[PDB]
Amino acid sequence: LVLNDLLICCRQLEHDRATERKKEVEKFKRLIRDPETIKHLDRHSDSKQGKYLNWDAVFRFLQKYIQKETECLRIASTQASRQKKMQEISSLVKYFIKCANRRAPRLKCQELLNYIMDTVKDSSNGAIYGADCSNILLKDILSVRKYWCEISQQQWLELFSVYFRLYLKPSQDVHRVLVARIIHAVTKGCCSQTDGLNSKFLDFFSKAIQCARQEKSSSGLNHILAALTIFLKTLAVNFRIRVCELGDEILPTLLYIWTQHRLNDSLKEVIIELFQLQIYIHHPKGAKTQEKGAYESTKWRSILYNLYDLLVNEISHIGSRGKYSSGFRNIAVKENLIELMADICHQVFIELGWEVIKDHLQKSQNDFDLVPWLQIATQLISKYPASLPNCELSPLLMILSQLLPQQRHGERTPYVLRCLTEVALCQDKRSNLESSQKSDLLKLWNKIWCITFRGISSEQIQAENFGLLGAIIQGSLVEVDREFWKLFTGSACRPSCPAVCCLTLALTTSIVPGTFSLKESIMKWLLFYQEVPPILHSNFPHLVLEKILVSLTMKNCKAAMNFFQSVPECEHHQKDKEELSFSEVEELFLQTTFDKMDFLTSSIGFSVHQNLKESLDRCLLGLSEQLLNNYSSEITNSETLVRCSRLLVGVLGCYCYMGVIAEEEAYKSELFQKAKSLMQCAGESITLFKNKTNEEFRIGSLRNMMQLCTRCLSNCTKKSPNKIASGFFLRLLTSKLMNDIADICKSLASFIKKIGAINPLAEEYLSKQDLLFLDMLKFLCLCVTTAQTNTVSFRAADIRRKLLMLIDSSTLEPTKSLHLHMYLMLLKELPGEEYPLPMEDVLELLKPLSNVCSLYRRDQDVCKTILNHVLHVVKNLGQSNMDSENTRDAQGQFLTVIGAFWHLTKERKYIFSVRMALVNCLKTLLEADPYSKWAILNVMGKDFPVNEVFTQFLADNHHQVRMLAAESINRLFQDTLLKALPLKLQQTAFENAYLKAQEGMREMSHSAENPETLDEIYNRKSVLLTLIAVVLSCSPICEKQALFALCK
Ligand SMILES: [Zn+2]
C-alpha cells in the first residue's frame, strides 16, 4: 500500500518541475520518516525477491533526481546559490543513508562507492560537494564493519588511486587533511582486509615526501607517514630489499624536513617510528654485519651517521623531554628517542665509541645535560651487553661513582642507580675478566655499596637502590654485612616488592648470621602483627613471601632457597608477552639468511627448626584472627582476605613440597581452617552481589578478587609448589560460592543494555559487567579443569554443565560481542588433554562453531582468532575413541569446519594471517595423529589426507606461510621420545615437499620483473634450503636423500 505511494512520489520526483520537485522532496522525506514505509522497505529489501521497491531502487531514483538538477543547472551570487544547493543535496543524501542505515546495513556498498567515486572524480560541481561526499564516505562507509569487510580489493585500489591523485593536486588545507585521513584509512583497510598494495604504489608515497621538501607546511604529513609505516610493515616481509632501497632514498628527505623546518610532536613521533622501522629492517635484532644478517650499504651508513648527529642535537634541546605534569621539572627524555638512540649507538660504535658517552657524563654541568646520557648508557648496556668493552668496565664506574653522592637524594639519583644496576648485571654476565680488572672492580663496587647504603631510608628511591643492592648481591660483587640484615629487621623500612626481591637474592647468595633471633625478627618484620599489614595492601609476586618464610624456618636457609629457585619451568605454558610487534618479522629475516637455526639445537634431608615453625604458625594465625575479628561487610576489602588465604595456602604448599609435613596433615591443620573461614568471608561478598547486580562500585573489587583467584590456581602438571598451592586453594573453595559465581555468570550473560572500523573483539564494546563476567568465566573454567585431579567439596560436573548451558542454540547470540568473547574463551580453556572431556561435552562445545564461522565470514581478524581458539580442541579429539559414535560425530564437525576454511583458502578469499592460522591448525592435527586414520578433509565429495594438504602451503605466495610450513615440516617425519614414521611415508613426504618447493621456485622464476622478484628468488631459495635442513636434521632415514638433493 505505502510502497505504491513511495513509487508515485519518486516517479513524480523524476519530473522536471521545480515547485513540484520541492513538494515531492518534502513528501519523500516525510515517507522516509514513516515507520510503516520503513518496515515495508527493509523487509522487502532483506527478502531480495525482486519486488522492484527496495532501498537500492529508491536510492537509484534519488540519484536520477540529483543528476536531473545537475544537468538542468549546468547551463558570485550564482556560484553561492550553486554551492548552497550542493550543500543541501549532500545533506539530503546523508539523511537518506542515515535512515537507510539506522538499524542495519540495507544499502549495498557498491552503489554508494560508485556514487562517491563519480562525485569525487569530477573537479567541477564545487569542492564543497566533494568534501561532503568524502566526509560521508569516511563516517558512514568505512565506519561500518560489514562495509569494511565486504569491499573488494579492486575497489580498495581504485579508492586509493583516486584519493591519492586528488591529494597530489594542490587544494585547500582542510580538504587536504581530510584526504590524508581517508588515505590512511584506505591503506589500513587494504593492508588488513585484503592483499596488500602493489609495491609500485610506493612511488606515490615517495612523491608526496618530495613535496614535503618543497612546500614549507606539513598538511596531513602525519597521516601520510602513518600510512607509509603501515604499508612498509605489511610489505617488508617479502620485499625486504625493496623496502631497504626506498628507505635509503627517502630517509635523507625526512632528516632534512626534521632539521630545516620546525614541526609538531605527532610528526616527530611518526618520523621516529619510521626510523625505528628502518633500523629494524636493516639490522634485525641488532645485527651489525652482513654475515650476521644485516643489509648494509654506504648510503645507509651515511644516513646512520647523519641521524645520530640529528638525534644528539635533538637530545640537546628542551622540548624533547617528559611532560611537565604539574611542573616537577620532568628531566627524562621520552622512551622512543632513547631506544632509537641506543640502537643507533650500537650500530655505530673510528673515534665515536664509548669515549663520547664518558665525556658527556663527565663534562655535563646540570642534570638536564646529564640524565639523557645516563638513559642512553642504561639502555645500551641493558639491550646489548656486549657493547661495553671489558677494558671500559673499570673506568665507567668511576664516573658513575662521582655521580652517586649529593648528601641527599637528587633528580639524577634514580638514573645513576639504574645505570649502576645495568653495569653490575653486565659485569656478572661477562665472566671473562682479568685478575687486576676483577680487583679494581671489586674495590669500586665496595665503594659504591658504601655510598648507596647511606640514604637507604629515602623512601623516594627505594625501588632503585633496592634493585642496585639486589643486583650487586646477585653478582656476588661484595659480601653482606650485619647492617644489611639490620636493614630488614627492626621495622627500619616498610616491606615492599623490591625489598622482598632483595631479601630473596640475599638468602639465595649469602648465609644468615646469628644476631636464631635474626630469623624470627625478619619474620615478624614481614608479618608485622599490628590498619592493614603491608603485604595485604599490594599484590606480591606469586609464592615469594611464602618461599622466604618457609626457607627461614629451616636448618640451612641458603640450601632451601636454592632448592626453591632451582625448579624446572613449564615448556607449554611459559608466559604471554609481545602479542603484536615487528619482532616476529625480525625473526623471519634472521631465519631467511640462515643466521638463526631454531629447529636444530629432587632432594631430601631438609629439616625444620621446630620453634621457628610454631613461631611462624602463631604469627600467621594472629594475622588471620586480626583480619577475621576486625571484619565487616564493607569496612575491610575482601581481596585482603583472599590474599591472606593465598598466603596461608602457599606456606602450607611449600611446607608440603619440601616434605617436612605430610599433605594429609596440612588439611587437618588450623591454618587450613582459618583459610576456609577467610574464603567464606570473602564469598559472602559474591553472594551479596548475586542478590543485587545493578550496582557498579562492587564491580572493581569483584574483578580484583576474580583476577587474584585466577592467579592463585594453575593447570600445570609438574611437581612445583605451584601445583600443591593451587590444589590446596581449590580444595579451599565451597559449593555455595561456586554455585553463586555460576548464577552471576548466567545473569550477566543474558543481560541487555542499549582506524575506520573497530574490531568486534576490541575490548571497547565491553562494559564493566562484561569484564567481570569474563573474569568469572575464566576462574570457573580453571576450577573445572583443575578439579579433575582432586577430591573437592564442590562437584565439577555440575559446574561444567552450567558452563556449557551458556552456549545453547536457544540462548547464544553470536552477533553480540560478549557472546563471541565467552564462546572463544570456552573453546580456549575448557578442553584438556590430561583429563579429556567426555565426547558429549565436546559435541556440545563444537555445535555452534559452524554458525559463528558463518556469521563472521569475510572478516579476516575474527576468522584468525576463531582458528587460533579452535586449534585447542584437537588435543581433546582423537583420544582412544571411548564413545565411537560421538567421537566420529565430533571429528566430522571439526573436519567439516576445517575443510570449509581450506576450500575458501584455495580461492583468493583469506589473507596470509588466516592462512597461517590454518597452517597452525593443520600442524596441531598432524601432531594429533601422524597417520591420517581420521584427520581427512572432505571437500566437494573428495577426501584429502592432511599430510598432502600440509605440504601444499610450501608454495604459498606469502613468505611467512612458506617459512611456517617449512620450519614445521618435521611433523611428517616424526611421531612427536620421538618415534620415527614408517620408511614409505617418510620418503613419500620428502619427495612431495621437494617437488612442491621446486615447483614454486620454477613457477616464480620465469621472467616476471626480476628487479622486483630478486627478493622472490632469495625467499624461495631460502624456503627450499630450510626445508632440506629441517628434513636432514629431524629424520635420520632421509639424511643421504636430503644430502643428494642438496648437491643436485
Ligand atoms: Zn605446567
- Residue 308 one-letter amino acid: Y
- Residue 339 one-letter amino acid: E
Write the CB contacts of 788 (distance below 8 Å, at least 6 apart in sequence): 796, 832, 834, 835
Cα angle value 236/239/241 (rounded, 5°): 100
Distance CA 545, CA 10 (A): 78
Q: Distance from the CA of 337 to the center of ligand 1, in angstroms?
A: 39
Cell numbers representing residue 547 in the block: 618461599
Q: Distance from the CA of 723 to the center of ligand 1, in angstroms?
A: 9
Q: Distance from the CA of 721 to the center of ligand 1, in angstroms?
A: 12
Distance CA 604, CA 994 (A): 54
Q: Which alpha helices (DSSP H) does 294-367 contain, by range?
A: 298-316, 335-348, 354-362
Cell numbers representing residue 15 in the block: 519530473
Distance CA 665, CA 384 (A): 50
Q: Distance from the CA of 563 to the center of ligand 1, in angstroms?
A: 19
Q: Distance from the CA of 541 to the center of ligand 1, in angstroms?
A: 18
Q: Distance from the CA of 568 to the center of ligand 1, in angstroms?
A: 10
Q: Distance from the CA of 866 to the center of ligand 1, in angstroms?
A: 24
Write the CB contacts of 877 (distance below 8 Å, at least 6 apart in sequence): 842, 887, 890, 891, 894, 928
3-state secondary structure of 862: helix
Distance CA 350, CA 497 (A): 44
Distance CA 832, CA 886 (A): 17
Q: How many CB atoms lie under 10 A from the CB of residue 236?
A: 24
Q: Distance from the CA of 720 to the center of ligand 1, in angstroms?
A: 9
Distance CA 373, CA 396 (A): 13
Q: Distance from the CA of 711 to the center of ligand 1, in angstroms?
A: 14
Cα angle value 586/587/591 (rounded, 5°): 115
Whether 307 contacts 275, CB under 8 Å: yes
Distance CA 406, CA 584 (A): 45
Q: Distance from the CA of 835 to the center of ligand 1, in angstroms?
A: 14
Q: Distance from the CA of 960 to the center of ligand 1, in angstroms?
A: 29
Nearest Cα residue to 911 out of 195, 149, 26, 148: 195
Q: Distance from the CA of 571 to the center of ligand 1, in angstroms?
A: 7
CA distances to 75, 367, 570, 727, 789 from 719, rounded to whole Å, are 88, 51, 10, 12, 14
Q: Distance from the CA of 726 to the center of ligand 1, in angstroms?
A: 12
Q: Distance from the CA of 778 to the center of ligand 1, in angstroms?
A: 17
Q: Distance from the CA of 573 to the center of ligand 1, in angstroms?
A: 6
Nearest Cα residue to 711 out of 697, 725, 701, 700: 725
Whether 496 contacts 462, CB under 8 Å: yes
Whether 741 contacts 779, CB under 8 Å: yes
**DSSP string covering 747-770:** HHHT------S--TTSSSS--HHH
622: Cα separation from own chain's centroid:
43
Q: Distance from the CA of 741 to the center of ligand 1, in angstroms?
A: 26
Q: Distance from the CA of 572 to the center of ligand 1, in angstroms?
A: 7
Please report the beta strands in 524-586, taking only residues with DSSP state E, as ranges in sequence order.
none
Q: How many CB atoms lie under 10 A from the CB of residue 476?
A: 10
Residue with cell 620421538: 978
Q: Distance from the CA of 544 to the center of ligand 1, in angstroms?
A: 18
- Residue 696 one-letter amino acid: E
- Residue 415 one-letter amino acid: Y
Q: Distance from the CA of 570 to the center of ligand 1, in angstroms?
A: 5
**DSSP string covering 247-287:** HHHHHHHHHHHHHHS---HHHHHHHHHHHHHHHHHHSTTS-
Distance CA 698, CA 769 (A): 10
Q: Distance from the CA of 785 to the center of ligand 1, in angstroms?
A: 13
Cell numbers representing residue 897 in the block: 569446519
CA distances to 827, 951, 980, 1028 from 971, rounded to whole Å, are 24, 11, 10, 14
Residue with cell 564493607: 634
Distance CA 994, CA 1029 (A): 12
Q: Distance from the CA of 578 to the center of ligand 1, in angstroms?
A: 21
Q: Which residues surround ligand 1, an ion (CB under 5 A)?
A: 570, 573, 716
Cell numbers representing residue 973 in the block: 617425519
Cell numbers representing residue 863 in the block: 576468522
State the Cα torsion 468-473-475-479 to the nearest 10°.
130
Distance CA 178, CA 128 (A): 12
Distance CA 155, CA 178 (A): 19
Chain breaks in the chain (C to N over 2.5 A) after: 75, 349, 515, 530, 601, 754, 976
**Residue 368 burial (10 A CB sphere; 0-12, 13-18, 19+):** middle
Distance CA 862, CA 149 (A): 11
3-state secondary structure of 632: coil
Q: Distance from the CA of 722 to the center of ligand 1, in angstroms?
A: 9
Residue with cell 648465609: 511
Q: How many CB atoms lie under 10 A from the CB of residue 426?
A: 19
Q: Distance from the CA of 771 to the center of ligand 1, in angstroms?
A: 26
Give the strand pairing for 942-945 and 936-939: antiparallel
Q: Distance from the CA of 654 to the center of ligand 1, in angstroms?
A: 17
Write the CB contacts of 1019 (distance below 8 Å, at least 6 apart in sequence): 238, 592, 959, 962
Q: Distance from the CA of 883 to the center of ligand 1, in angstroms?
A: 28
Q: Which alpha helices (DSSP H) does 553-669 contain, by range?
A: 557-565, 583-592, 610-629, 638-657, 663-668
Q: Distance from the CA of 828 to the center of ligand 1, in angstroms?
A: 16
Whether 884 contacts 837, CB under 8 Å: no
Distance CA 186, CA 193 (A): 10
- Residue 964 one-letter amino acid: L
Nearest Cα residue to 393 out of 431, 341, 367: 431
Q: Distance from the CA of 829 to the center of ligand 1, in angstroms?
A: 14
Residue 943 dihedral angles phi and psi, to the nearest 5°: -100, 135
Nearest Cα residue to 862 out of 757, 968, 745: 757
Q: Which helix (H) or strand (E) holds 942?
A: strand 942-945
Write the CB contacts of 1038 (distance below 8 Å, at least 6 apart in sequence): 973, 986, 987, 990, 1031, 1032
Distance CA 301, CA 846 (A): 56
Q: Distance from the CA of 649 to the center of ligand 1, in angstroms?
A: 19
Whether 912 contacts 961, CB under 8 Å: yes
Cell numbers representing residue 732 in the block: 579451599
Distance CA 971, CA 932 (A): 12
Resolution (A): 2.8
Cell numbers representing residue 449 in the block: 655499596
3-state secondary structure of 197: coil
**DSSP string covering 354-422:** HHHHHHHHHS--SSTTTHHHHHHHHHHHHH-GGGS-GGGHHHHHHHHHHHS--SS--SSHHHHHHHHHH
CA distances to 414, 424, 458, 494 from 409, rounded to whole Å, are 9, 21, 7, 18
Q: Which alpha helices (DSSP H) does 458-516 contain, by range?
A: 462-474, 482-488, 497-509
For residues 746-775, one letter each, b for 16 or more C-beta atoms within 10 angstroms of the residue's C-beta and e for the rest, the string is bebbeeeeeebbeebeeeeebeebbbbbbb
Nearest Cα residue to 567 out of 743, 702, 741, 718: 718
Whether 956 contacts 915, CB under 8 Å: yes
CA distances to 290, 329, 1026 from 596, rounded to whole Å, are 14, 45, 11
**DSSP string covering 41-64:** HHHHHHHTS--S-SHHHHHHHHHH
**DSSP string covering 671-711:** HHHHHHHHHHHHHHHHHHHHH----SHHHHHHHHHHHHHHH
CA distances to 862, 907, 914, 1040 from 910, rounded to whole Å, are 11, 8, 6, 38
- Residue 851 one-letter amino acid: N
Distance CA 702, CA 689 (A): 9
Cell numbers representing residue 749 in the block: 550473560
Q: Distance from the CA of 390 to the center of ligand 1, in angstroms?
A: 40
Residue 974 dihedral angles phi and psi, to the nearest 5°: -145, 150
Tell me the longest C-alpha to C-alpha distance in the chain.
106
Whether 708 contacts 769, CB under 8 Å: no
Distance CA 339, CA 361 (A): 18
Cα angle value 258/261/265 (rounded, 5°): 60
Whether 290 contacts 296, CB under 8 Å: yes
Nearest Cα residue to 82 out of 132, 133, 126: 126
3-state secondary structure of 974: strand
Whether 339 contacts 377, CB under 8 Å: no
Q: Distance from the CA of 114 to the center of ligand 1, in angstroms?
A: 56
Cell numbers representing residue 615 in the block: 613461631
DSSP state, 930? S
Q: Distance from the CA of 928 to the center of ligand 1, in angstroms?
A: 19
Q: Which alpha helices (DSSP H) does 907-1013 contain, by range?
A: 912-928, 946-951, 959-967, 983-1005
Q: Distance from the CA of 707 to the center of ligand 1, in angstroms?
A: 19
Strand partners, 938: 943
Q: Distance from the CA of 714 to the center of ligand 1, in angstroms?
A: 8
Q: Distance from the CA of 459 to the center of ligand 1, in angstroms?
A: 38
Write the CB contacts of 977 (distance below 8 Å, at least 6 apart in sequence): none
Distance CA 109, CA 996 (A): 40
Q: Distance from the CA of 647 to the center of ligand 1, in angstroms?
A: 21
Q: Distance from the CA of 577 to the center of ligand 1, in angstroms?
A: 17
Instruction: Name the packing angle between helices 1039-1047 and 983-1005 (round to 10°).
Output: 20
Sign of CA dihedral 636, 642, 645, 651: negative
Distance CA 919, CA 580 (A): 19
Q: Distance from the CA of 351 to the center of ligand 1, in angstroms?
A: 51
Whether 401 contacts 447, CB under 8 Å: yes
**DSSP string covering 428-461:** HHH----HHHHHHHHHHHHHHHHHHHTTGGGSSS
Whether 712 contacts 653, CB under 8 Å: no
Nearest Cα residue to 496 out of 457, 441, 446, 452: 457
Cα angle value 45/811/746 (rounded, 5°): 140
**Residue 645 burial (10 A CB sphere; 0-12, 13-18, 19+):** buried
Cell numbers representing residue 91 in the block: 545533506
Distance CA 620, CA 609 (A): 17
Cell numbers representing residue 486 in the block: 639490620
Residue 795 dihedral angles phi and psi, to the nearest 5°: -90, 115
Whether 658 contacts 606, CB under 8 Å: yes
Q: Distance from the CA of 789 to the center of ligand 1, in angstroms?
A: 14
3-state secondary structure of 71: helix
Whether 708 contacts 640, CB under 8 Å: no
Distance CA 601, CA 633 (A): 58
Q: Distance from the CA of 310 to the center of ligand 1, in angstroms?
A: 49
Q: Distance from the CA of 569 to the center of ligand 1, in angstroms?
A: 8
Cell numbers representing residue 395 in the block: 673506568
**Residue 417 burial (10 A CB sphere; 0-12, 13-18, 19+):** buried
Q: Distance from the CA of 547 to the center of ligand 1, in angstroms?
A: 19
Write the CB contacts of 1041 (distance below 8 Å, at least 6 apart in sequence): 987, 990
Cell numbers representing residue 303 in the block: 644516513
